[PDB]
Amino acid sequence: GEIQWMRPSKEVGYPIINAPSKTKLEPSAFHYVFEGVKEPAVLTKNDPRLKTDFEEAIFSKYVGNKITEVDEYMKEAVDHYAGQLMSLDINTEQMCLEDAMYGTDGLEALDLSTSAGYPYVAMGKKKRDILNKQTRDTKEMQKLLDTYGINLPLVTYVKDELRSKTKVEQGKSRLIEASSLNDSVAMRMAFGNLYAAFHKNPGVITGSAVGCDPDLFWSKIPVLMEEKLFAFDYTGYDASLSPAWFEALKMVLEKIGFGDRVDYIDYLNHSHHLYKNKTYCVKGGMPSAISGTSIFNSMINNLIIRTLLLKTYKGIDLDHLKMIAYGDDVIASYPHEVDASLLAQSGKDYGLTMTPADKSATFETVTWENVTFLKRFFRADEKYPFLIHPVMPMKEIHESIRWTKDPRNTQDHVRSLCLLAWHNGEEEYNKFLAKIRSVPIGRALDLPEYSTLYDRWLDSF
Numbered sequence: 001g002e003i004q005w006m007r008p009s010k011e012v013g014y015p016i017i018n019a020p021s022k023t024k025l026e027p028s029a030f031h032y033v034f035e036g037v038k039e040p041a042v043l044t045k046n047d048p049r050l051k052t053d054f055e056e057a058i059f060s061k062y063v064g065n066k067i068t069e070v071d072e073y074m075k076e077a078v079d080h081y082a083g084q085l086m087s088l089d090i091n092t093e094q095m096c097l098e099d100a101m102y103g104t105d106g107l108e109a110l111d112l113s114t115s116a117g118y119p120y121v122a123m124g125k126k127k128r129d130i131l132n133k134q135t136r137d138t139k140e141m142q143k144l145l146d147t148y149g150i151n152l153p154l155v156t157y158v159k160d161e162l163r164s165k166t167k168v169e170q171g172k173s174r175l176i177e178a179s180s181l182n183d184s185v186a187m188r189m190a191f192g193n194l195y196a197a198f199h200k201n202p203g204v205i206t207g208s209a210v211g212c213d214p215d216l217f218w219s220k221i222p223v224l225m226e227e228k229l230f231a232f233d234y235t236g237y238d239a240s241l242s243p244a245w246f247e248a249l250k251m252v253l254e255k256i257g258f259g260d261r262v263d264y265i266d267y268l269n270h271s272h273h274l275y276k277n278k279t280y281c282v283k284g285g286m287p288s289a290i291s292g293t294s295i296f297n298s299m300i301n302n303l304i305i306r307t308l309l310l311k312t313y314k315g316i317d318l319d320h321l322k323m324i325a326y327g328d329d330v331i332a333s334y335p336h337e338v339d340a341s342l343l344a345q346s347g348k349d350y351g352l353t354m355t356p357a358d359k360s361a362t363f364e365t366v367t368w369e370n371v372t373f374l375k376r377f378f379r380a381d382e383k384y385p386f387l388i389h390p391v392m393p394m395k396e397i398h399e400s401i402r403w404t405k406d407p408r409n410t411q412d413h414v415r416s417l418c419l420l421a422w423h424n425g426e427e428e429y430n431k432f433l434a435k436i437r438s439v440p441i442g443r444a445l446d447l448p449e450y451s452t453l454y455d456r457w458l459d460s461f
């Protein structure tokens, strides 16, 4: 991805977009009961903690576009992946407006708490004013589609979340690039059934984990993986994607019966954004918050890994490449050992910056003991080995519990963390609960005990 130009929005007929500047994150009642070093991300140019220009830092993710056309290895990757998706008999018909707005089997209703995007954010009109969960009314939406059309600018917001000390100082805040409600609706109508098929089929056929339930999915992954695992991290995946990867994605869509609306992908590839009082044009780079972001990043990841394998290992049998992606995150396997370092080398030529799995210093062999997916390790249950625990290290949970965005959601927030933590074992879980209960706020929470969560887990399969 590369920003073509940036200029005052007024110069191109757009209003100034008001974006938050004060974090809603504040120390929680557990701030001093648990250790952590993360703080709220810099949200404004004048944040005192900044040690470098903010604007420059947030847009530096756009490292450029390394490739223009779809080469022969990519075309082969496209054919193999598309052929694989064909086996799912994905319903290629457009999804009706109602289901696209309020959901259906395999697709949850539009989130009413997220931005409505342009021009609604500028007209002070909320989603709640347009959608009605109880009525499933499409009349108001339909008039808006007719009035403002599609392919509207994407509104950019700095994401309010916790970040490392370094990322705070370097102004490395992440951005929310929200599509207009009109575009979310149009894209969900165009690809609604594709989204549903993926959500209902997490695994090695879709090559996607989007919509998965880790508590149940983890026991299914090993049987899907090959004999040899391999993985690696991407540096700024979304923003590094070159236009050619979007074209390759369109080829897949065409081959599986959606050639009908590949135009929507152009809207993702060549897009314009509004940030504060500026407007800018980007070539390449996947927008962080459009409907289908994680699904398309996942599809593209399937194309990337297949491409690098073909380019690096001629004669590779893609029918034995078993991988599952969640955006840029991936867990992959092959009957034979492969060199991630070589794949990373080949990756640079395609505009991808690949590094050792989980921040490792060197490319090491990935095993069932050290592999992670969605930050979770895999650990067989002690009593029933066939049941696999998704294990997120307590470090992440501790970092998260030390802050709150709304005192009213304290119990939901803490319970959510408990659902993640108990997998670390009864001893650790109890220590976690004891610390929570070392302060008044924690003592007033209704939290599940270990045996309750274990029983509930067994009863969920």
Ligand code: NA
Pocket (backbone or CB within 6 Å): 001, 268, 269, 270, 271, 282, 283, 284, 285, 286, 287
């Ligand atoms: Na883009």
